[PDB]
Amino acid sequence: FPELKNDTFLRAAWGEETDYTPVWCMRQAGRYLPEFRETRAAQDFFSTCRSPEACCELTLQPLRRFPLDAAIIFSGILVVPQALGMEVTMVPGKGPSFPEPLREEQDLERLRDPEVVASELGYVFQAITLTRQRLAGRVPLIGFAGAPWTLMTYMVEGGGSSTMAQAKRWLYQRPQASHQLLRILTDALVPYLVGQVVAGAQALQLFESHAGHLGPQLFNKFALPYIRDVAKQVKARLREAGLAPVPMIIFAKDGHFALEELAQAGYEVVGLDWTVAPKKARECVGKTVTLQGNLDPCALYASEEEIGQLVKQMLDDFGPHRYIANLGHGLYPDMDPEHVGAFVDAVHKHSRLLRQ
């Protein structure tokens, strides 16, 4: 692959000092860009995900507008449940759905052997290799997947939920079947994530988007072991294949209660939502791991000047070391691309001022 030119994001992820603070935005390829809407209008979402050229194009679009310090491959988190044998539908103005969710233990019988899932996800690897080539070393390419618990929630609930009452009812009433499903997902995620790196991914982020519905006790029992296993096994397989392990990011949204554990879970970077004050986060995680985040995405509705001030304050709190700037969640569809650019520029400007 082409040699990396701007590696600031990788150096930061590993905890090295850098000349400025690298920045990227979750959902940087998203509907807030008119050009994203134009490209997506041709196919449906899961069909777009299966076109390497379409994925590459959507990945590159934000970088043409903004000097972001990383690209993230365009794909879905639900590709993994899909590859395990569940049928997803994408609903107009309402979202993804599994019309036949898992609701009893016997339903696990209809899933694929997790060892074959990577083969079913060849299209993601194709998208990654293409994008890595087309980026031509400008910035690093991040691969991603959903964490085991979060994927379990979509598979059991059949979509999003305000309570995760059905998936939590599995944890309490069906602990064994829950651990079985969580192990299947882990065993599918490991080869998938390793394949992303084989294909050219230079960093990996695991999205535990539904962490917050668990308290500490359930998170430690049912989410954390599998978070840990994913990191440990992905690094093991990469080293055994003669490849370099990549920095791994764990993002547990609404996971304030788990930060101290997450810092010891074998991820280089711990991503933060906007509800955790940066200084408190730093106390929780300690002085090795890198923090990523965490501006309220809604702060981008403020004026460009206001965004600059909020960014300044955020960077003062995090300090210069062991930090990668981002939002505390993904960009929303009604956001102004010029305010995303304001965000990116302010991180670069103030992080330099903070050093010299």
Ligand X SMILES: Cc1c2[nH]c(c1CCC(=O)O)Cc1[nH]c(c(CCC(=O)O)c1C)Cc1[nH]c(c(CCC(=O)O)c1C)Cc1[nH]c(c(C)c1CCC(=O)O)C2
Q: How far is the CB of 294 from ligand X (least distance, A)?
A: 13
Shortest distance (Å) from residue 354 CB to its own copies = 27
Q: Cβ closer to ligand X: 274 or 350?
A: 274
For its own copies, which residue of 93, 109, 162, 217 counts as binding (CB under 8 A)? 109
- 80: number of CA atoms within 13 Å, CB side? 31
Contact 222, 214 (CB under 8 A): yes
Main-chain dihedrals φ then ψ at residue 182, nearest 5 degrees: -65, -35
Judge whether 82 and 121 are in contact, CB under 8 Å. Answer: no
The DSSP bridge pattern shows strands 141-146 and 71-72 to be: parallel
Choose the one of ligand X, its own copies, none that binds residue 207, judging by a C-beta under 5 to 8 angstroms depending on kind.
ligand X
Smallest distance from the beta carbon of 254 to ligand X, in angstroms? 10
Q: Would you say 2 or 175 has its CB closer to its own copies?
A: 2
Residue 107 engages its own copies in binding (rule: CB under 8 A):
yes
Among 4, 15, 85, 337, the residue binding its own copies under the rule CB under 8 A is 85
E-state strands within 141-265 = 141-146, 203-208, 248-252
Closest CA to 115 of 144, 91, 84, 72: 84
> Using CB distances below 5 to 8 A depending on partner kind, what does residue 336 bind out of its own copies, ligand X, none?
none
Binding site for ligand X (CB under 6 A): 27-31, 45, 72, 74-77, 95-96, 144, 160, 207, 209, 253, 330, 333
- Residue 252's φ and ψ, nearest 5 degrees, are -105, 100
Contacts of 153 (CB under 8 A, 6+ apart): 161, 164, 167, 210, 213
Closest approach, Cβ 314 to its own copies, in A, equals 29
Q: Does 5 bind its own copies (CB under 8 A)?
A: yes
- Partner that binds at residue 5, options its own copies, ligand X, none, CB closer than 5 to 8 Å by kind: its own copies
The site partner of 110 among its own copies, ligand X, none (C-beta below 5 to 8 Å per kind) is its own copies
Cβ atoms of 77 and 155 closer than 8 Å: no
Q: Which is nearer to ligand X, 196 or 350 (CB)?
A: 196
Of 16 and 113, CB closest to its own copies: 113
Residues 96 and 80 sit within 8 Å (Cβ to Cβ): no
Q: Which residues contact 306 (CB under 8 A, 6 or more apart)?
A: 299
Under rule CB under 8 A, residue 133 binds its own copies: yes
The three-class DSSP label of residue 71 is strand
Residues near its own copies, by CB under 8 A: 2, 5, 60, 64, 85-87, 89, 99-100, 106-107, 109-110, 133-138
